[PDB]
């Protein structure tokens, strides 16, 4: 499971006729970096079968 | 469950072929991001 917890916001700023840049607005919420969890039990079983092969 | 957690940084500018061509700016995504993936394989050396 992979999550980016930061609640970012998109700011559309017009930089010419038609062109529009999507800037990152101020953060809403926590100051946490994205991460991924993997069940240690299942990963230990899988790693065991890996080292067997 | 005791699931291991891995830290991930994020890039919006990537160059997998800047020399062949051009770079890409991944637009920012509003809100929190969460995807569930099957990890089926590995690549080792």
């Amino acid at each position: 499971n992979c999550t980016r917890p930061n609640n970012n916001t998109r700011k559309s700023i017009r930089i010419g006729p038609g062109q529009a840049f999507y800037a990152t607005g101020d953060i809403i919420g926590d100051i946490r970096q994205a991460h991924c969890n993997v069940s240690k039990a299942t990963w230990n079983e899988t790693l065991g079968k890996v080292v067997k092969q | 469950n005791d699931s291991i957690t891995l830290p991930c940084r994020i890039k919006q500018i990537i160059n997998m072929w800047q020399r062949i061509g051009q770079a890409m700016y991944a637009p920012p995504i509003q809100g929190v991001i969460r995807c569930v993936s099957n990890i089926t394989g590995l690549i080792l050396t």
Epitope: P5, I28, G29, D30, I31, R32 | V32, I33, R34
Partner: antibody, heavy 132, light 102 residues
Framework: PQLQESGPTLVEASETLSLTCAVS??????????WGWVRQPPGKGLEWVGS?????????????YHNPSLKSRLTLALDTPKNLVFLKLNSVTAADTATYYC?????????????????????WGRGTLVTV | ALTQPPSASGSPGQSITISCTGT????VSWYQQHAGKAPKLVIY???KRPSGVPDRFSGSKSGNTASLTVSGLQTDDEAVYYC??????????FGGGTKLTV
């Protein structure tokens, strides 16, 4: 920013007490503050009732915090476009007779860790007297 | 829980100090409520004042005891002062209230 309470000032025993706060000058959708209530019995101290906010995270559609004792008998509600707060108290007793204040909670609401932390009440209301 | 003295009267001009015991965190705040009226935030984040609140009011903390200090009491300062803090996971508690009389 002005909070105007409205609702029945006189409710009969064993019935459902309903009160509504009307916000003016700020948006209830705004994630900068939490919205809730604080009751002051005629003389006693301030007791926290509860507060909520629709600004959620990836696993929920919002946050709602209740004071442990009143949780079973209370219901909190927010109308975001009309900037209105709702409060419903079931099975009211003479212990619930109080001056109810509409409260805006400041704190680590805009940048929190693990969970939002509403702490100080920056904006209060005029409050209404509810007699059971 | 949060505890406060029942009263803490003082003559105008004197420097006065009120205390609040039972704080486990820095989510301490102070509100002022006149008789028959509504409370007003006067202190947040232990020591911060909202814009427009006079600078005679200051907040400090020693150990588990927070303190509010007023230098130069005025006749319009008479009111009931309440303290508030965050406890447990997300719960909020207040003190009993202190009646400051001039």
């Amino acid at each position: 920013p002005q909070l105007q309470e409205s609702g029945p000032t006189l409710v009969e025993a064993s019935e459902t007490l309903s009160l509504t706060c009307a916000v003016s000058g700020d948006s209830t959708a705004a994630c900068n503050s939490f919205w809730g209530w604080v009751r002051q019995p005629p003389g006693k101290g301030l007791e926290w009732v509860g507060s909520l906010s629709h600004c959620a995270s990836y696993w929920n559609r919002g946050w709602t915090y209740h004071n442990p004792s009143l949780k079973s008998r209370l219901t909190l509600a927010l109308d975001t476009p009309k900037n209105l707060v709702f409060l419903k108290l079931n099975s009211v007793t003479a212990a619930d007779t109080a001056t109810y204040y509409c409260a805006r909670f400041g704190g680590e609401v805009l940048r929190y860790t693990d969970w939002p932390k509403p702490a100080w009440v920056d904006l209060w209301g005029r409050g209404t007297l509810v007699t059971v | 829980a949060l505890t406060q003295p029942p009263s803490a009267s003082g003559s105008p001009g004197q420097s006065i100090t009120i205390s609040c015991t039972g704080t486990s965190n820095n989510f301490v705040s102070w509100y002022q409520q006149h008789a028959g009226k509504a409370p007003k935030l006067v202190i947040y984040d232990v020591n911060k004042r909202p814009s427009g609140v006079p600078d005679r009011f200051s907040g400090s903390k020693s150990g588990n005891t927070a303190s509010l200090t007023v230098s130069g009491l005025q006749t319009d300062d008479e009111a009931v002062y309440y303290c508030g803090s965050l406890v447990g996971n997300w719960d909020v508690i207040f003190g009993g209230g202190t009646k400051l009389t001039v």
